[PDB]
Amino acid sequence: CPTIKLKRQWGGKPSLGLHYQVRPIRYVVIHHTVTGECSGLLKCAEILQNMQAYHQNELDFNDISYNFLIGNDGIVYEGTGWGLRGAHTYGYNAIGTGIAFIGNFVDKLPSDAALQAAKDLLACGVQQGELSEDYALIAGSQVISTQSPGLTLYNEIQEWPHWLSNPHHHHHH
């Protein structure tokens, strides 16, 4: 179980409105942030503070969109957090946990530390009853119109246990 850096520990603000999920969650959606690459809490904190400000005050979300974010040093940062509905993936916010790797992974992979931290986070979520034992792992790009989490990273997660090749998606309208 990785030690999660909670909102207070990175200087983050409260959610503007909490919406609870039904546990255990059966879907994990992997994303990248594109902007914000950073190593360690000292550097990452300001980046996360301003990402939160952009999401809350410009995109009109209740909090940073992702449930968790993972930096280059392998630190797991609480975004929206376990069991709360985020805003990372239409159709998969109420029923999924969204995890973003901080950085742009179209052409490279996250660090070994970051990848191992994600694996540790998933296994811990199952152990704690946050995720179902048979959860489905998907990339954002499989269900909404996005390049996230980047082709190189998408190719990596396809080799992980739990990867689901054919997830459903609904029409917005």
From Swiss-Prot:
Keywords from the named record: Disulfide bond, Hydrolase, Immunity, Innate immunity, Protease, Secreted, Signal
Reaction catalysis annotation: N-acetyl-D-glucosaminyl-N-acetylmuramoyl-L-alanyl-meso-2,6-diaminoheptanedioyl-D-alanine + H2O = N-acetyl-D-glucosaminyl-N-acetylmuramoyl-L-alanyl-meso-2,6-diaminoheptanedioate + D-alanine
EC number: 3.4.17.13
One cellular component (GO) term of this entry: extracellular region
Primary localization: secreted
Recorded consequence of changing Y90A: Strongly reduces PGN-binding and activation of Toll pathway
Induction: Strongly up-regulated by PGN from B.subtilis. Regulated by both imd/Relish and Toll pathways.
Tissue expression per record: In larvae, it is expressed in fat body. Also expressed in uninduced hemocytes and mbn-2 cells.
Outcome of swapping S148 to A/C: Abolishes PGN-binding and activation of Toll pathway. Abolishes L,D-carboxypeptidase activity on DAP-type PGN
Subcellular location as annotated: Secreted
Domain N-acetylmuramoyl-L-alanine amidase span(s) in chain numbering: 23-150
Region (Peptidoglycan binding): 51-54, 61-66
Effect listed in the UniProt record for changing C44Y: In seml; induces susceptibility to Gram-positive bacterial infection
Disulfide bonding pattern of the chain: C1-C124, C38-C44
GO terms of molecular function: muramoyltetrapeptide carboxypeptidase activity; muramyl dipeptide binding; pattern recognition receptor activity; peptidoglycan binding; peptidoglycan immune receptor activity; zinc ion binding
Site positions per UniProt: Interacts with peptidoglycan: T146
GO BP, sorted A to Z: defense response to Gram-positive bacterium; innate immune response; peptidoglycan catabolic process; positive regulation of biosynthetic process of antibacterial peptides active against Gram-positive bacteria; proteolysis; response to peptidoglycan; Toll receptor ligand protein activation cascade
Similarity section: Belongs to the N-acetylmuramoyl-L-alanine amidase 2 family.
Function in brief: Peptidoglycan-recognition protein that plays a key role in innate immunity by binding to peptidoglycans (PGN) of Gram-positive bacteria and activating the Toll pathway upstream of spz activating enzyme SPE. Has no activity against Gram-negative bacteria and fungi. Shows some partial redundancy with PRPGP-SD in Gram-positive bacteria recognition. May act by forming a complex with GNBP1 that activates the proteolytic cleavage of Spatzle and the subsequent activation of Toll pathway. Binds to diaminopimelic acid-type tetrapeptide PGN (DAP-type PGN) and lysine-type PGN (Lys-type PGN).
Protein name: Peptidoglycan-recognition protein SA
UniProt organism field: Drosophila melanogaster (Fruit fly)
